[PDB]
């Protein structure tokens, strides 16, 4: 049987208006016998036809893979608008329906703390700058790292962990060359969450 995947849009996309948030509907393991896939898109019940559908790509048990992407609107998704994808195939007993929407519950602003390089780290060849985030709802968040108005891509961020009370937390960790840190450069911790004024806050870090 063919499985369906309905991905929510990148939290950075839903929070940056210069970007376009999109819900993706992936269909995997689609057979040679019945390879046609018909996508239906719904918003709270109301069907929409604006969606774009890419051609097929090959798979392994000599099968196919189909993808349909639907532009959603920033203000729309953030309200908690329910998005539905109806996938139909001749090899399907019935039409398959997946549903994804921004999580309900009282939204909360994240707190951001910065942890400068450790005493050990400072002896090593590269240092790790750390950014700790806690008390946020929903888990939709986008932590990124920048230095001198340019991106720093050499970082890793844990998935949002559920807090005991009901909020979320995570840790992001940028690894930089020590000489760059020692040279006095400032490194910023960009956090984009729904419950942030202008969806943006920034704590930075310098020697």
């Amino acid at each position: 049987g063919p499985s369906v995947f309905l991905f929510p849009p990148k939290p950075k996309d839903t929070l940056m208006i210069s970007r376009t948030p999109e819900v993706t509907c992936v269909v995997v393991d689609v057979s040679h016998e019945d390879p046609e896939v018909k996508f239906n898109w719904y918003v709270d019940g109301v069907e929409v036809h604006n969606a774009k559908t890419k051609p097929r790509e090959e798979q392994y048990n000599s099968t196919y893979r189909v993808v349909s992407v639907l532009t959603v609107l920033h203000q729309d998704w953030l309200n908690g608008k329910e998005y539905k994808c109806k996938v139909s195939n001749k090899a399907l007993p019935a039409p398959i329906e997946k549903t994804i929407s921004k999580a309900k519950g009282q939204p909360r602003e994240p707190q951001v703390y910065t942890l400068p390089p450790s005493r050990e780290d400072m002896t090593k060849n590269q240092v790790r700058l750390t950014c700790l985030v806690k008390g946020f709802y929903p888990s939709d968040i986008a932590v990124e790292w920048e230095s001198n108005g340019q991106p720093e891509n050499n970082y890793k961020t844990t998935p949002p962990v559920l807090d005991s009370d009901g909020s979320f937390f995570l840790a992001s960790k940028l690894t930089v060359d020590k000489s760059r840190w020692q040279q006095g450069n400032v490194f910023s911790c960009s956090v984009m969450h729904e419950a942030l004024h202008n969806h943006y806050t920034q704590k930075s870090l310098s020697l």
Partner: peptide, 13 residues
């Protein structure tokens, strides 16, 4: 007021 991110606009209140 508008917050930006590395050149691209984030959000305006």
């Amino acid at each position: 007021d508008c917050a930006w991110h590395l050149g691209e606009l984030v959000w305006c209140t």
